[PDB]
Design a protein around this ligand. Structure first.
Ligand SMILES: Nc1ncnc2c1ncn2[C@@H]1O[C@H](COP(=O)(O)OP(=O)(O)O)[C@@H](O)[C@H]1O
Ligand SMILES: Nc1ncnc2c1ncn2[C@@H]1O[C@H](COP(=O)(O)OP(=O)(O)O)[C@@H](O)[C@H]1O
Ligand SMILES: [Zn+2]
Lengths: 193, 92, 638
């Protein structure tokens, strides 16, 4: 590693190696490169916490490889969980409820975000999913945790994972004459995370 | 293994960029540029530092960090306004 | 051999002397006078009186506690004969408790001590304690006191005896569910639940949601390949250092106590002094009052965060979770009415339907942090309404109905619709839920993040220091300076404040409360709103541990209320400015704030406060619109 590390200007080597079979999109590949390495999850003085992983949203017209990149982050990151907008449910992402087959007690089972702990979560067609399925993502993108209260289970799990999302603008084409906040069905809160 | 650390040398470089971006979004339909958006510059700087395996956030790392973050806000603007902010942030 | 154990117990009751009195003989005699057939034996006196029996009891209580029941019964009946059933043993102890996770396969049949919260209870059931039977074959009779009937007669075929019902005795028993404190549970783990059983006088003392201290026997019973369900025979349930008291009393004596704690709340964040101070009021909470008709006033202070995204509003809730001794954090999406409030479920261990609490039941006596409050369903909100305004939860499921109390303080963070709160609109329009909810929260905070130059630079410099690591040294030095309080010490201080003091208002504070609220009412808010301010001054008095709430608390409370509720003869002068400006500015014209200052205030036509209030009033009356932080003012309507 240190032989490559001492090479002058290593940053452009890594970025040029992000899914090399995709032409152009360098200002997008750098976001993929930066999210794979992540930041420092600084638990400042213990009493304060800040997420470390970099969240990326890919938006644009069809035919721009907004999805195949997410079919590359899956094969490159150590731990990756892939999901699709309409094919995912709120319970299936955060956590599910089960009864123990031995002790007959309420037990909880981890979802996609719980699996992707210390990894990445990949959501395709982020806009087309229903509002409720999109709502549960809010906590994960800032708290990196799943908070649940169901059937007597009151707890919180660990969901440290970056989220890479692909979407489409309203009407299927991007109107360059209008602001982004007007081009998509999402809102400032969701875009803020 | 790598957890680069920070020294507050480029504080003026980042802070004035943060103020500049906020000023241009006060009356334009655009991203919700907030404190969480500033943190991306520092964290994305950590990634560039953590690519070199260095333990220190150098001035160059923030230079790559600021260019990526500021360009994103400029690109997601209407055509009539995009060309004006193209030159307003040429320092960065 | 075992007679010595009985004799030693007899000396420990009849002859044990403390405080120059026969405390155990007298308290048992008093119980006999009350006709309560139970005795509360303090384990700390037992070890000081006879360590030898303590060794046997601690190690092998299998025969000792049968001796306890029979010896106390004989001794108490002896006292009853002297003065003129089986007496239940009750144990009070202050020895160290074993953590619920630390219970293992080694403490079997050993008396252990635990601490936790009851999450569910069962209905009472009758168990036999004394029986008399008769042989069906030959009418042979005998008495019997696990226990099973004889297989052959003592005078007849297999199992010849039948129970004589009218000459038998039974006792009542209850089954309880205990789990460890969620605050002591690290994330990623569901608190362990433990089944407990209590009988006779120990039944029905605790409801679900009650925090208790346990003294009992650890054991198992069959109900996996050989997985026996553990359970506890309850023996006794209970529900600060001198230097710590002086330390916290000195904290109360600190001249800058209020500001130091205000800064101490989330020191990583910059400014935001008002929202910090209201959350401080949330930690203390109000003081409880009871009407002469029996109703109770809700003492919890509930606050709604209703501002733009990216204003650390989510981080504010998280910090409270780490400072409130009783803290529950949950999201709006990942919650349900049954999960939040109480529910009824069948216990598979005893094959009975138990009443089981929820998240809003666990947080009883503390604070809950709900996030994305707008995103939860109306039914969950409806159940919250009863908890917010009555501190009760009513359950009606299957075929049973019940009502359960819940003294829960609720801190709700809500994302306004359209993403950003539009100042052109009433708060009702920037909100998607039932309007009656607005009448529930005592305070709401519509935070704003309008772009600015010098404030951003100061905030930005603060953030860089945190990632630099300088904030770690800065906070420690501030803690050394006393300007900041440790998160553990503050929680210890808050817990001390809650248990010890209960202030009450003063006439001077109340008379100003009525006068100011009258001005608020005349300008327009309901009668309920003023009484919500009473909680805030009680909360500030609680923090200072003052015996009475003071008017100097109200001033900040009024300012906080004005800076929270009013987010979106001097009145004659203000309205005259409205009259004058409607002539100076025709509809559709624009001007600047400083222009009005130079033309109307510098000429002394009106006061600057009248200028501020008229502009405040005109905007809400759709007359004018303020733009660009006051650099432009446009008259929108008549
Ligand atoms: N910049 C690019 N370089 C190479 N191939 C591309 C590029 N953009 C799109 N493609 C091709 O177009 C297809 C886009 O697929 P997909 O990612 O589903 O599009 P969308 O952006 O609608 O998600 C891919 O099969 C890819 O081979
Ligand atoms: N005044 C402030 N001081 C320090 N950090 C702040 C401040 N305001 C916002 N932040 C940053 O914002 C983030 C929290 O935002 P959050 O409340 O989660 O956004 P949302 O409102 O979308 O939930 C934190 O990472 C914090 O560092
Ligand atoms: Zn017989």
């Amino acid at each position: 590693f240190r032989k490559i590390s001492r090479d002058r200007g290593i940053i452009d080597k890594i970025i040029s190696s992000m899914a090399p079979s995709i032409y152009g999109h360098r200002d997008i590949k750098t976001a993929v490169a930066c999210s794979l390495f992540g930041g420092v999850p600084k638990n400042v003085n213990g009493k304060h916490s800040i997420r470390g992983d970099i969240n990326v949203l890919l938006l644009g017209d069809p035919g721009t490889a907004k999805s195949q990149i997410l079919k590359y982050v899956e094969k490159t990151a150590h731990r990756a969980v892939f999901a699709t907008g309409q094919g995912a449910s709120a319970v299936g992402l955060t956590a599910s409820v089960r009864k123990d087959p031995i002790t007959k007690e309420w037990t909880l089972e981890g979802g996609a975000l719980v699996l992707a702990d210390k990894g990445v979560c990949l959501i395709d067609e982020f806009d087309k999913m229903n509002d409720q399925d999109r709502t549960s993502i809010h906590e994960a993108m800032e708290q990196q945790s799943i908070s649940i209260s169901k059937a007597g289970i009151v707890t919180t799990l660990q969901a440290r994972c970056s989220i890479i999302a692909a979407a489409n603008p309203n009407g299927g084409r991007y109107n360059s004459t209008l602001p982004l906040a007007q081009n998509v069905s999402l809102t400032e809160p969701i875009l803020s995370r | 293994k790598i957890y680069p650390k920070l020294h507050q040398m480029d504080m003026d470089k980042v802070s004035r960029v943060y103020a500049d971006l906020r000023r241009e979004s006060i009356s334009t339909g655009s991203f919700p540029i907030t404190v969480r958006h500033l943190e991306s510059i520092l964290r994305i700087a950590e990634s560039f530092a953590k690519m070199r395996l260095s333990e220190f956030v150098s001035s160059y790392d923030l230079d790559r960090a600021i260019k990526v973050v500021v360009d994103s806000f400029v690109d997601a603007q209407k055509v009539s306004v995009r060309r004006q902010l193209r030159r307003s942030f040429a320092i960065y | 051999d075992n007679t010595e154990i009985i004799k030693s117990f007899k000396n420990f009751i009849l002859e044990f002397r403390l405080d120059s009195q026969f405390i155990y003989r007298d308290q048992l005699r008093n119980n006999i006078l009350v006709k309560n057939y139970s005795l509360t034996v303090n384990m700390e006196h037992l070890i000081g009186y006879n360590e030898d029996i303590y060794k046997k009891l601690s190690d092998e209580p299998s025969d000792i506690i049968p001796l306890f029941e029979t010896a106390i019964t004989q001794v108490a009946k002896r006292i009853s004969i002297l003065s003129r059933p089986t007496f239940q043993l009750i144990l009070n102890s202050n020895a160290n408790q074993i953590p619920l996770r630390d219970l293992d396969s080694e403490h079997v049949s050993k008396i252990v001590r635990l601490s936790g919260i009851i999450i569910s209870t069962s209905v009472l059931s009758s168990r036999a304690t004394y029986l008399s039977i008769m042989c069906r074959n030959c009418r042979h009779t005998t008495s019997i006191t696990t226990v099973s009937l004889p297989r052959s007669c003592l005078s007849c075929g297999p199992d010849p005896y039948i129970i004589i019902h009218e000459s038998s005795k039974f006792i009542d028993q209850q089954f309880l569910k205990l789990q460890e404190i969620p605050e002591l549970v690290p994330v990623g783990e569901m608190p362990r639940n433990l089944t407990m059983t209590c009988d006779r006088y120990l039944t029905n003392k605790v409801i679900p949601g009650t925090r208790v201290t346990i003294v009992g026997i650890y054991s198992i019973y069959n109900s996996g390949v050989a997985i026996r369900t553990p359970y506890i025979k309850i023996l006794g349930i209970q529900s600060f250092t001198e230097e710590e008291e002086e330390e916290f009393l000195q904290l109360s004596r600190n001249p800058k106590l209020y500001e130091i704690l205000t800064n101490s709340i989330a020191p990583s964040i910059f400014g935001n002094e008002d929202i910090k101070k209201a959350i401080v009021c949330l930690l203390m909470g109000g003081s409880k009052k009871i009407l002469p008709d029996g109703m109770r006033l809700r003492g919890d202070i509930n606050v709604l965060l209703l501002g733009d995204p990216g204003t650390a509003k989510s981080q504010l809730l998280k910090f409270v979770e780490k400072v409130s001794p009783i803290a529950v954090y949950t999201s709006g999406k990942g919650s349900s009415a049954a999960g939040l409030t109480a529910s009824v479920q069948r216990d598979p261990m005893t094959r009975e339907f138990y009443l089981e609490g929820g998240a809003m039941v666990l947080a009883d006596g503390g604070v809950v942090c709900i996030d994305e409050f707008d995103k939860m369903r109306d039914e969950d909100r409806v159940a919250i309404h009863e908890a917010m305004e009555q501190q009760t939860i009513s359950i009606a499921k299957a075929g049973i109905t019940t009502v359960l109390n819940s003294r829960t303080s609720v801190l709700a963070a809500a994302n306004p619709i359209y993403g950003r709160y539009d100042d052109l609109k009433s708060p009702g329009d920037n909100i998607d839920f039932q309007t009656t909810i607005l009448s529930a929260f005592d305070m709401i905070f519509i935070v704003k993040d309008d772009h600015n130059e010098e404030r951003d630079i100061s905030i930005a410099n603060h953030v860089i220091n945190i990632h630099t690591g300088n904030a770690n040294a800065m906070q420690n030095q501030q803690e050394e300076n006393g300007s900041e309080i440790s998160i553990e010490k503050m929680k210890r201080y808050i817990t001390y404040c809650r248990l010890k003091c209960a202030p009450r208002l003063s006439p001077q504070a109340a008379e100003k409360l009525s006068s100011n609220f009258v001005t608020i009412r005349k300008q327009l808010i309901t009668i309920r709103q003023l009484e919500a301010i009473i909680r805030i001054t009680e909360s500030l008095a609680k923090l200072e541990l003052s015996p009475i709430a003071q008017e100097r608390h109200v001033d900040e409370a009024i300012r906080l209320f004005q800076a929270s509720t009013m987010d979106a003869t001097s009145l004659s002068e203000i309205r005259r400015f409205e009259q004058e400006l409607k002539r100076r500015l025709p509809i559709g014209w624009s001007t600047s704030y400083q222009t009005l200052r130079r033309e109307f205030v510098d000429t002394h036509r009106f006061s600057q406060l009248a200028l501020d209030k008229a502009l405040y009033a005109l905007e809400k009356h759709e007359t004018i619109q303020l733009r660009h932080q006051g650099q432009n003012i446009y008259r929108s309507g008549v």
